[PDB]
Design a protein around this nucleic acid. Structure first.
Lengths: 99, 186, 247, 278
RNA sequence: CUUAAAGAGUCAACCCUUUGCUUAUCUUCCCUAUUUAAAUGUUAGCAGCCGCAUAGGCUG
DNA sequence: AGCAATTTAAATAGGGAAGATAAGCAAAGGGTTGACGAAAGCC
DNA sequence: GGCTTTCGTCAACCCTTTGCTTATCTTCCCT
């Protein structure tokens, strides 16, 4: 990401050598979420099923985001294996889940 | 404006007889305009002398033969008898046009040095010019305040030898008209 | 046609900051008018008005209390008590760098006028303070109003005093309109019948209570009319500006 | 307008001004090279001549067009120009009368509503609110207007002629432009001798009236000279906005008169508008 | 002759200690730098040999 | 031994996460700065 | 007969914690 750089597109140049970000790779590890509502393609494991590119969050407003399933599991609501696997996948992804 | 002020000034000068005047005007181009009016109405270069002391390189293009414009610096004129008392027979072209002109259509800075100078003998030529010639200052309101002060000094010096001052300004302020009258009265 | 002599950066220290009972700080225009008439007496150059500005001014003390002066046992007959500390009467002291501009009328060269003002200032005392330093005074003339402003701007940098007048009284408007009060003169209470303990025995003497006007500080260039900064002795046993009340 | 950078500011605003009007912008100040300046003069004298319809052939009058000339006081002195209308930045009242004389100078048709729109403030108000009319005006440090609002110091609707300058008023000079003008004129050109005055006596013997009263007293004025396309000093030719320029004459020789104050920085000479601060 | 005239404020000092700012991030797509042209300005001031010469001449 | 050319255009947009805390002590001094009135030796 | 020294006489608070203003700059013009 650049702003004032007098150059339109930079590249991640680890010591000159062309490289790609670890977050790019780690996002591609966690592109396993095929368990949302309109499940046609795997999306990146996110607390909201959110993608910047498509401009939509596949798990927002329809009670399958990570926070409601986490609250549910904690309380006692039996999480379905896919929902359980999604919550576990977000836990090994990481992130602040408080508020 | 547009009523022919400078032509009326020449008419007023010629009402008293033959004309001997210094048309001191601001700007080079306004002196060029008054010279062109003087040329096309009745005045030749044996009586008129347009003086702009910078030798500007503004030439007329298109057709030199079909111009009928661009009043120039020749002054066939008549050399006055005062040139023999000036240093080295006055000078070349410029001071001969200054002193010996019956009608001197000039930029005004060739006349305001008559009132005096810091260093040198640059006072004598406009002094002896304004001694025997009338003074015609047109649109004196466009000058600065110190410029108008030294112009009224020139008016006082011109009136010191009986010559006639023609001021031609439409937007005159009583103050200006008054102090120019008081300079002429002194 | 007006003539002025300006003494710029008059560093004075030991100024008696007690302008009156209720004003402590910058000396009022009665002080500088008194300085002007003092030179009218010593040097003979008779002074109409003085325009004074403050470059720097600090009252000695804190922000709420002035530093009192350690008094010396100088009265007669109190020996024996001289070993103890002398009692302190209230006289605040201050330092101030001033710029003075005297309206004078002079008929000789500017060099002897500058020399006379310098010889006065070398023996002068601004508000009871020793004149620590001062630049060489320079003469400037106000032929017209633009020339008056030339003299005005020749006192840069200084904060001159402009009169803003009294509406109801001093305390009220000092809070309301936030202007500064100072002594513009005095009010005569009683004729003094005992001239034995005075400076002159023939000069008539009156007990006085200081009248005050309300004034503001404006930089000399921001003052529109220089006559509103030139204080002079008015004929009401007061001092006043030539330009009147600053608007 | 009043000064040169004011003229290029009005020009650069009007060139970038989005409107349905077909604005065609000229710059007409005095800081120009010998060639360029002279060319502007001859063109303007032959297009603003309205005693006949010869100008229809020097401009494109077929298409509805706004031919706008942004100029400094070089237009109000000695120019036989005839504009349909003028927008005046106020500096002095004789400037108002002279730029009224540049509108309907050759025609005799009376205007119906309004042919002059006077600006509310000079542009020096945003740079110096203490004094703003001193550039090309008789306001100064000794003669300050109490208010700079032209509703306060001028009539809101007024027939501008020489009458206000001809009458002469000394009272209320701090809140009207005309009485400010008359005041200065009687307070500098007075019946005294002073030293820089007009009745000067006793001082003619001295060099004082030629030193303290300097004829054409201007600023230092050094001359940056263009020699065959190559400038002399710190000039740096630039490129104008090319939005609405109607006429732009090029120059190769000549000289520009730069004040010593603006010599510090580059005057940045340009073919369209001469000198500015950039 | 300016609320004129006049005046020593001195001294002394321990700010202590303690500390988890951690957590997870897709920058990304897109695309014509195009076309010219004398390097001139003598472009070199040399190689022998005639001589005491680093004086002066000759040879091509 | 100075000569080194001109114009033309420099990217639109979408985002700059909230949740936590922000110490409690104990100190902070006074020492001189009094003029009238009244006994009371003293020239 | 003042006159100068020293001792006795008479008191009692409710404080508040920065702005005041805020600096002396170029149009014409021709030489």
């Amino acid at each position: 990401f650049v702003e004032n750089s007098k150059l339109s597109k930079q590249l991640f140049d680890l010591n000159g050598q062309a490289a790609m970000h670890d977050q790019k790779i780690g996002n591609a590890i966690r592109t396993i979420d095929t368990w949302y509502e309109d499940a046609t393609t795997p999306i990146a494991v996110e607390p909201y099923g959110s993608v910047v590119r498509n401009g939509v969050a596949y798990r927002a407003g329809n009670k399958t985001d990570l926070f409601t399933l986490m609250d549910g599991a904690v309380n006692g609501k039996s999480l379905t294996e896919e929902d359980q696997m999604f919550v576990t996948a977000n836990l090994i992804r990481g992130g602040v889940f408080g508020g | 404006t547009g009523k022919g002020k400078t032509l009326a000034n020449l008419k007023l000068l010629q009402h008293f007889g033959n004309v001997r005047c210094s048309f001191g005007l601001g700007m080079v181009s306004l002196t060029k305009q008054t010279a062109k009016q003087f040329l096309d109405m009745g005045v030749d270069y044996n009586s008129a002398a347009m003086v702009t002391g910078f030798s500007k390189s503004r030439f007329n293009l298109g057709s030199e033969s079909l111009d009928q414009d661009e009043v120039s610096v020749e002054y066939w004129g008549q050399t006055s008898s005062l040139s023999k008392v000036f240093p080295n027979n006055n000078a070349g072209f410029k001071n001969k046009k200054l002193l010996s002109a019956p009608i001197l259509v000039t930029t005004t800075d060739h006349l305001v040095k008559a009132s005096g100078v810091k260093k040198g003998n640059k006072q004598m030529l406009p002094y002896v010019r304004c001694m025997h010639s009338d003074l015609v200052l047109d649109e004196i309101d466009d000058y600065g305040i110190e410029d108008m002060v030294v112009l009224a000094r020139l008016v006082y010096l011109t009136a010191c030898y009986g010559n006639k001052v023609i001021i031609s300004s439409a937007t005159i302020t009583p103050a200006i008209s008054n102090i120019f009258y008081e300079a002429y009265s002194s | 046609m007006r003539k002025f002599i300006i003494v710029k950066n008059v560093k004075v220290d030991g100024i008696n900051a007690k302008s009156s009972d209720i004003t402590v700080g910058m000396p009022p225009a009665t002080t500088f008018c008194g300085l002007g008439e003092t030179m009218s007496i010593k040097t003979g150059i008779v002074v109409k008005a003085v325009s004074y500005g403050s470059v720097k001014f600090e009252v000695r003390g804190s922000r709420f209390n002035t530093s009192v002066t350690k008094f010396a046992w100088q009265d007669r007959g109190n020996g024996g008590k001289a070993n103890n500390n002398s009692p302190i009467q209230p006289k605040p002291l201050a330092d101030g760098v001033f710029t003075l501009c005297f309206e004078v009328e002079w008929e000789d060269c500017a060099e002897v006028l500058v020399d006379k003002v310098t010889n006065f200032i070398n023996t002068a005392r601004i508000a009871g303070g020793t004149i620590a330093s001062f630049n060489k005074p320079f003469v400037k003339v106000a032929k017209d109003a633009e020339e008056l402003a030339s003299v005005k701007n020749a006192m840069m940098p200084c904060y001159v005093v402009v009169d803003c007048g009294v509406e109801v009284n001093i305390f009220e408007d000092a809070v309301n309109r936030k202007l500064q009060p100072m002594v513009n003169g005095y009010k005569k209470l009683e004729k003094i019948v005992d001239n034995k303990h005075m400076r002159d025995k023939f000069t008539p003497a009156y007990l006085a209570t200081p009248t005050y006007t309300m004034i503001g500080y404006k930089m000399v260039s921001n003052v529109d009319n220089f006559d509103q900064a030139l204080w002079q002795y008015g004929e009401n046993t007061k001092v006043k500006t030539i330009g009147g009340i600053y608007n | 307008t009043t000064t040169i950078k004011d003229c290029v500011a009005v020009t650069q605003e009007l060139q970038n001004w989005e409107t349905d009007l077909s604005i065609k912008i000229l710059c007409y100040h005095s800081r120009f090279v010998g060639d360029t300046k002279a060319q502007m003069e001859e063109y303007l004298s032959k297009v603003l001549n309205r005693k006949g319809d010869e100008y229809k052939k020097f401009v494109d009058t077929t298409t509805p067009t706004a031919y706008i000339v942004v100029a400094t006081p070089v237009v109000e002195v000695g120019r036989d120009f005839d504009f349909d209308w003028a927008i005046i930045e106020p500096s002095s009242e004789r400037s108002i009368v002279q730029c009224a004389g540049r509108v309907l100078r050759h025609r005799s048709s009376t205007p119906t509503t309004h042919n002059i729109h006077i600006l509310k403030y000079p542009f020096k108000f945003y740079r110096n609110s203490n004094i703003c009319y001193d550039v090309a005006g008789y306001e100064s440090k000794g003669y300050k207007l109490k208010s700079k609002n032209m509703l306060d110091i001028y009539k809101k609707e007024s027939i501008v002629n020489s009458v206000n300058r001809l009458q002469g008023d000394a009272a209320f000079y701090t809140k009207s432009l005309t009485a400010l003008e008359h005041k200065v004129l009687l307070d500098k050109l007075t019946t005294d001798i002073a030293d820089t005055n007009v009745f000067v006596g006793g001082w003619q013997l001295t060099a004082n009236p030629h030193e303290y009263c300097k004829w054409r007293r201007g600023t230092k004025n050094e001359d940056l000279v263009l020699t065959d396309g190559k400038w002399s000093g710190n000039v740096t030719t630039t490129k104008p906005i090319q939005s609405k320029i109607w006429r732009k004459w090029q120059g190769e020789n000549g000289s520009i008169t730069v004040p010593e104050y603006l010599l510090d920085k580059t005057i940045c000479y340009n073919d369209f508008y001469g000198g500015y601060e950039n």
